[model samples]
Target: GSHMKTIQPASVEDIQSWLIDQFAQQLDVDPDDIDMEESFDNYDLNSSKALILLGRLEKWLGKELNPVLIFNYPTIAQLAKRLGELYL
Candidate 1:
């Protein structure tokens, strides 16, 4: 069964874990290898994948994100902090 959960980030930490889990699953890495400080570029994700992250975040955040917002918040920790402040 393909049962993927759409997450609601309760705090920055939850966003951190969600990022790690998503990257780990998509990139076939151990979740421990992922962290807040890691750049999304480390995954070598193309724009398509990055856009999907934005889409998922839009759902998770319950708002539409600016198209370039991910680039502005390049690190998981940075994104988590800003999103928590403005949205969560």
Candidate 2:
């Protein structure tokens, strides 16, 4: 499970791209179509998707994240910055 043993520390921009790709893949949309400022609701993400992404993010970062933080941040730009400051 720890496949990313040599993973480089991700920057804020890297986190942004990772989130953009995660949302894009699940929604079956091009990454370019995802706006950094758009809320997850705008992409039709239900609570299940929110939890799924929370798990994925935790795995990627090797750190736990608050489930409600996504709702508080609500946008890629904000979430990426918050996570980078707190965890990265």
Candidate 3:
């Protein structure tokens, strides 16, 4: 079954959790292993991974995203808030 839910992240914590969950699901790693403050480069994330993240973000938020968004906001916490602002 498919279910839909709308998320309005009002705080950094909310955005952080959302990022952690998304990365955890796609990378097959525990959410706790992700460093919310670290750059994606430290994780060996390449252009493909960035694209994948953007694609999943669009699906999750039901909105389109620019590929440059990730580069502009390198940290998950920053990216999360930016994404929230984009959709919410």
- Candidate with best lDDT: 2
* Global lDDT of each candidate: 0.73, 0.77, 0.70
Ranking by TM-score: 2, 1, 3
lDDT (Cα, tens digit) per residue for candidate 1, span 22-58:
7777877776776667667766565678888778877
Q: For candidate 3, write residues 1-88 as lDDT tens digits.
A: 1212234455656666767766666677777778878888777576678887677667766668886877788889788877667765
Per-residue lDDT tens digits of candidate 2, residues 1-88? 2111123337988888788777777777776678889888777676677888888887788878887787688889999889889887
Better of 1 and 3 by TM-score: 1
lDDT of 2 at 20: 78
Clashes of 1: 0
What candidate 3 gets wrong by more than 4 Å, as runs, is 1-14
**Better by lDDT, candidate 3 or 1:** 1
TM-score of 2: 0.84
Worst 10 residues of 3 by lDDT: 1-10
